[PDB]
Amino acid sequence: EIVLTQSPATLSLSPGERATLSCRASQSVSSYLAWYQQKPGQAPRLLIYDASNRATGIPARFSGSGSGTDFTLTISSLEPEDFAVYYCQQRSNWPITFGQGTRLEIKRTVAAPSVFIFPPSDEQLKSGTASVVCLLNNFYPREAKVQWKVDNALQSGNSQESVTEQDSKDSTYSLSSTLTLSKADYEKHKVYACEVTHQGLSSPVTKSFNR
Amino acid sequence: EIVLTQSPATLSLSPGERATLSCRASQSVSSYLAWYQQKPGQAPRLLIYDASNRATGIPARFSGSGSGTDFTLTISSLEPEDFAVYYCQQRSNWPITFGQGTRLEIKRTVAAPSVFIFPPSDEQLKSGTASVVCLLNNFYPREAKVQWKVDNALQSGNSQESVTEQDSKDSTYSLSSTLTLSKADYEKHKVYACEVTHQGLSSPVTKSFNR
Amino acid sequence: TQSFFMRESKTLGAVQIMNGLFHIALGGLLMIPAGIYAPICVTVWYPLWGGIMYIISGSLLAATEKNSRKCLVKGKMIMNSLSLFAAISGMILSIMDILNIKISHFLKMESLNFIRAHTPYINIYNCEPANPSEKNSPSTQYCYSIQSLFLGILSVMLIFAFFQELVIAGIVENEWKR
Amino acid sequence: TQSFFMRESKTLGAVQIMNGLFHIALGGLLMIPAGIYAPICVTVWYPLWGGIMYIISGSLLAATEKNSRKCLVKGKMIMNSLSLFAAISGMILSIMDILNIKISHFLKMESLNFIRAHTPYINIYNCEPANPSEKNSPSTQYCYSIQSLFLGILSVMLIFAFFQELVIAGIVENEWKR
Ligand SMILES: CC(C)CCC[C@@H](C)[C@H]1CC[C@H]2[C@@H]3CC=C4C[C@@H](OC(=O)CCC(=O)O)CC[C@]4(C)[C@H]3CC[C@]12C
Ligand SMILES: CC(C)CCC[C@@H](C)[C@H]1CC[C@H]2[C@@H]3CC=C4C[C@@H](OC(=O)CCC(=O)O)CC[C@]4(C)[C@H]3CC[C@]12C
Predict the structure, then answer these.
(1) Domain of residue B121, CATH code
(2) Which of A33, A53, A94 should be substituted to probe chain D, the one whose Cβ sees the most D Cβ atoms within 10 Å?
(3) Which of B125, C32, D53, D113 has fewest C-beta within 10 Å?
């Protein structure tokens, strides 16, 4: 039924004063709305309701209003605890629909990434699998293009990767590509390598090891 | 949930005065009930509601009451239009459950049944099937035991039969067992026969034909 | 048959004006939008002319002493007779609409369309849940509450109308010895 | 300041007995089970106070002529003072309940248990569908009848309390020149 669209996330926010996003809808929703603040590790907190009344018991320096399909909110104060995701919802007709989420960033400078290699171990291969890990660290932003090639051949649908959070000191991101590989395929292949590209490098770089 | 059980049907009612049936329930139903009259060929008609009030606009010589799980109804008048099915329902808790049906009979004397044979025709077998029909008529009651044997062997799960209604003059029942048979099985078999048994015969009788 | 109220008749006609005011106020207060089938008090408009009649009767006794002729000495009989007739009509309607509420539907009394459109999806005479279960439902509870309220206001109107008729009958029997 | 009602004050006190009768009748009528949170007028038992105070004043004004001493002549000031104070409290509570009905919750006035068991499942202060849709549902549009009934009852109560206070103030101002 009712579907909500949100402004693109990962917005580059310099340490200034302006901070504005939007949350649109397809069908004309009612005048009343609701905005909430979500924080990780504990229960979320209310932000503003009806776009005309402030929070109850929580001081609010925000300024959010609007009508129809376009709504505008702006915050000027810069506190060290506002960096979180933002959710927008609606209550026009049941069932209700929820947003996806927009997380703000800290405007950290780019860092030069590094690479590493690790051949499979005897104990690892004796279990019935072989995994090679390439360690990626000190890179910005979180978006990166990393792929694997074996014997100068391309493979797909075999890599599972998870990202990490941001530290409270420098907000440094790390990655570690790990793929579980079969022994039979490990025996008949010669060259294993991993390639990474980023804005900090002017030419792709790869590392290879002897089996 | 609630399930209703009814008195056995096909009750032998001599042309007298007494006529009584029952409709029981498992769980204790409420005091109010409902009885209806169903006739074939047109819409049914109301009989009695709440077991304490007569019909509206229709004279009622019936006498039906009761409480708890046992209910009794009795009709003394004998009209030529009361021979039909009887339905009992309940409205204690949703969803409601309906009965199965009890049909009264006319107490007709037993009649001697007859048998007939019919070999498959050339036009019938040229179509791709062969059916043999044994005609049963002038029998009482509707219940009968008829089966088929081929080459002194018993077969099951191949016979479909439908019954007829009762005439307004003598209430005579008729039957015609017909089974569709394949050509390949028809070619390799020798003896076809059908057997019927009834109270009017002191020994089973069968008829056979030459192929 | 004891005559002891003629000499103190100043208050008897003095209270009647505000009795009529109370009657018309109750009639107006009973004109709240309720549902589709309005009661008998609507199709006859009895409270309006009843209160008008009562207030005119009360104002008739403004000048008890003889001031003019053929207007303050001749109307005293027609006015009290018509007041008594209005009272007896009052009891007839009151007994009818107090007896018709606890029994099944008797007559129609359709309400006018201007108020009907406000609440056109409910009925006031009967409300049954149409299901043996869910008896502890807010709908039936609210029906019982509003029915009790209507019965109470009707009983109040009955009692005060009966008292008004009693005093009117006394004042009309004061004039003539039958 | 023009004194013109002293000689004809018999009616003014005569109407008070049946005004108190109206007050007690309305108080009894309003005590039908209606909701979970009773209004402010329920827990204060004001109608009993008003009715008793009015009927005792009416009994006091039974014999204006000098018959006895220290009973029919001394209490005329305490009686008027207590009646005026009761009327003052009357319209104070009246304005309170007429202002707190259109605004958010202020206090609870929890009802007694004997009426509590009969009406557990309906609220009187506010009924809301809790859903933006289904606005044309009985559970939403089917509160306004009792809402308007209560509003009218409170309004007529306030008006008649004001009238009674006005006439009592005139009577007491007749007795003493301030
Ligand atoms: C001489 C009078 C004082 C005798 C008493 C008549 C009142 C009891 C009736 C007459 C017209 C009725 C009114 C007719 C219409 C409405 C509109 C209603 O609100 C609406 O429905 C808004 C209009 C709309 O939406 O159509 C509020 C009640 C009210 C004032 C009714 C209140 C009761 C009224 C005033
Ligand atoms: C003898 C007469 C002149 C004395 C005064 C009687 C009327 C002029 C007054 C008394 C109470 C008043 C009522 C008090 C409350 C309302 C509720 C009001 O309802 C609404 O407007 C709200 C509608 C909603 O949204 O529910 C309609 C007018 C009405 C009946 C008022 C109409 C005029 C009334 C009946």
Answers:
(1) 2.60.40.10
(2) A94
(3) D113
